[PDB]
Amino acid sequence: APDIPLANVKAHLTQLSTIAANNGGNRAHGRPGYKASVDYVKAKLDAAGYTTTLQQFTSGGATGYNLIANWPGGDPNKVLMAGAHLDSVSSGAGINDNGSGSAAVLETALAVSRAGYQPDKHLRFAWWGAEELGLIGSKFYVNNLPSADRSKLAGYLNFDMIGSPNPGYFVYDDDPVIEKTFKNYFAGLNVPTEIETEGRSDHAPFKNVGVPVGGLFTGAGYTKSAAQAQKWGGTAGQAFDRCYHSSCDSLSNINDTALDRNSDAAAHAIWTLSS
Ligand SMILES: N[C@@H](Cc1ccc(I)cc1)C(=O)O
Ligand SMILES: [Ca+2]
Ligand SMILES: [Zn+2]
Ligand SMILES: [Zn+2]
């Protein structure tokens, strides 16, 4: 797998930050900063050669969108998906929650095209709307995916909050092959990981219909323990993300090292699991 350039991921976050500032301070469902976020991500994918689909739904009286991006080619009967919710709460720009996962997934999709990769499995990336309303976009996708297409899914990888400023390195303890893939990447860095428990994200509708899932998380409102600060640094007794769901979930609310490592781990897992 390629090394995902941290600067490229950070540049997507800058664009999402400007989109929030240009649209009332947020990227929330039913508000213009969300569709503007979709438009940015979709244009990058279209230019890289993806087949993109805007999947519309209505929730709360307002139109929502999921953005689906299929990389042409690969085994139609073995589809590997990766995704991230692209909405924020209305209090702020949602840069860690979840610009971080959205940007890592986008940069991995662009890296596939830059590398000339032809995965054996068909790759499909997704950016979900209305996750903050209760997983509404990812539930809509799974609810509207015919059972014959559901059975073609080899896995769903989820990235939701992966740049927390006082990070831990959590790996979902779900499908064993996906989990092993992520833990192997972190072992090569000599960075320990822990099982995710803090978390309620967009892998749940896939997990609940038997699709193998996994993912990465760096923590939200829970407090980092003394033991976790000893293994990862940062500040014991402070939240992993002191700006969770806050107006201060801005460009300053990112730990570059965690964003870089989790973005690189995302690309590692997508390459490994697709061929
Ligand atoms: N989905 C939450 C943040 C979150 C990430 C990962 C897990 I696992 C659980 C929760 C939100 O959007 O606020
Ligand atoms: Ca990198
Ligand atoms: Zn989130
Ligand atoms: Zn959230």
Side-chain angles (χ1 to χ4, degrees):
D3 180 334
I4 296 299
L6 172 61
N8 293 8
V9 184
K10 295 272 288 188
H12 300 311
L13 297 181
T14 294
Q15 292 292 322
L16 294 178
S17 173
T18 294
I19 283 165
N22 290 168
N23 295 100
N26 67 71
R27 312 178 301 96
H29 171 74
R31 314 298 173 78
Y34 175 70
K35 180 57 158 57
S37 296
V38 171
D39 294 341
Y40 168 78
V41 177
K42 184 178 185 304
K44 295 304 181 192
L45 294 162
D46 277 340
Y50 280 83
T51 302
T52 57
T53 303
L54 286 180
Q55 176 178 62
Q56 198 174 295
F57 58 86
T58 295
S59 194
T63 303
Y65 309 84
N66 300 318
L67 169 63
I68 313 300
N70 281 273
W71 185 236
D75 187 344
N77 291 317
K78 302 179 172 182
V79 176
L80 181 68
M81 288 190 74
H85 70 98
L86 185 58
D87 63 320
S88 70
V89 294
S90 68
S91 76
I95 298 305
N96 188 41
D97 183 21
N98 182 37
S100 65
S102 293
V105 179
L106 170 60
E107 190 59 24
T108 295
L110 298 176
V112 167
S113 178
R114 282 190 322 255
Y117 181 42
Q118 174 176 280
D120 292 332
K121 295 199 179 70
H122 176 71
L123 291 175
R124 182 190 303 146
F125 297 95
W127 289 261
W128 310 117
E131 185 274 346
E132 299 289 4
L133 276 67
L135 319 183
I136 295 304
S138 58
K139 288 172 173 295
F140 184 92
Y141 181 82
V142 173
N143 290 346
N144 286 277
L145 189 68
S147 59
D149 291 296
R150 187 195 320 143
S151 62
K152 294 170 203 300
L153 292 175
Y156 171 74
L157 310 181
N158 191 57
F159 304 89
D160 183 357
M161 293 180 71
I162 61 168
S164 304
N166 181 28
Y169 290 92
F170 304 104
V171 175
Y172 300 7
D173 179 33
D174 286 307
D175 182 79
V177 174
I178 298 171
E179 176 171 18
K180 179 185 182 64
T181 305
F182 284 126
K183 284 184 82 279
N184 283 168
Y185 181 78
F186 285 97
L189 303 184
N190 193 26
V191 174
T193 63
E194 293 178 357
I195 290 174
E196 211 292 317
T197 60
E198 178 170 5
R200 312 204 270 83
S201 187
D202 297 293
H203 61 303
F206 291 89
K207 172 165 168 179
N208 289 348
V209 298
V211 173
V213 304
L216 299 179
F217 175 53
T218 49
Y222 279 19
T223 293
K224 174 177 279 176
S225 74
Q228 289 168 327
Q230 298 292 319
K231 57 179 73 158
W232 288 321
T235 311
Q238 298 291 319
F240 298 105
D241 186 343
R242 270 175 272 203
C243 287
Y244 180 52
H245 283 182
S246 301
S247 58
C248 61
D249 188 9
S250 69
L251 287 172
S252 56
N253 195 47
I254 289 291
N255 177 263
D256 287 0
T257 295
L259 182 61
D260 191 19
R261 290 169 173 172
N262 284 310
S263 294
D264 292 338
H268 180 89
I270 290 149
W271 253 256
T272 294
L273 292 162
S274 58
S275 283

